[model samples]
Target: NVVVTPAHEAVVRVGTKPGTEVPPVIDGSIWDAIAGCEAGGNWAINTGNGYYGGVQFDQGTWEANGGLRYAPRADLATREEQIAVAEVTRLRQGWGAWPVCAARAGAR
Candidate 1:
């Protein structure tokens, strides 16, 4: 159960709309720096390794946070999708998920 106010006071971003599916844009300049710090702002990249997408989400963490439904893997999902899900994770667990990159990027 959630409620959204007209004034946009403490807005909560939903994953998908009722129909005609299209991921919403919940991020702003706040993610620009973090994106660059994470994967150089390259959303469509896999590097043929385990890491994927702009935020570099692996299978376990990404899927655990409702990521597979968005795309096969982090490399497959759009930047907004990744960030949207990441926001959920960040809000729930702080920046501890990206200990290495988050710390290196000075994101706290």
Candidate 2:
């Protein structure tokens, strides 16, 4: 179940904005497959559903994963930046961080 908080409402009202780019990571299609399932391959996506970016990171999850070093949120960062943080999340939390999509994308 998705929870919608007042914070979510505020952030969604402001909407998503373009952010700076970062160094890229050259991985294979696993990441692509995950993004494909998460946000339909749109690296920069914010749907006002309390999730942001291609991989649909929540604010707390993004911050906990050190994503703020790249951008305020995942969608604000480049695909590469998002993937960089994703690597950290993957290492720490494993593919379980994105349970359904990871399974669908064959990430494990």
For candidate 1, the lDDT comes to 0.64
lDDT per residue for candidate 1 within 1-108, as digits (tens), equals 477444324334445642225456544233444566677877677776776777776767777676666676766767666776677678677777775666555555
Global lDDT of each candidate: 0.64, 0.70
Clashes of 2: 0
Using TM-score as the measure, which candidate wins?
Answer: 2
Residue 20 miss distance in model 1 (angstroms): 4.6
Query: lDDT per residue, candidate 2, 1-108, as tens digits?
Result: 486543222121223443333445554255667888888987688898767877887878777766776777888876776787787778767788786778777766
TM-score of each: 0.63, 0.69
Q: Which candidate wins on lDDT?
A: 2
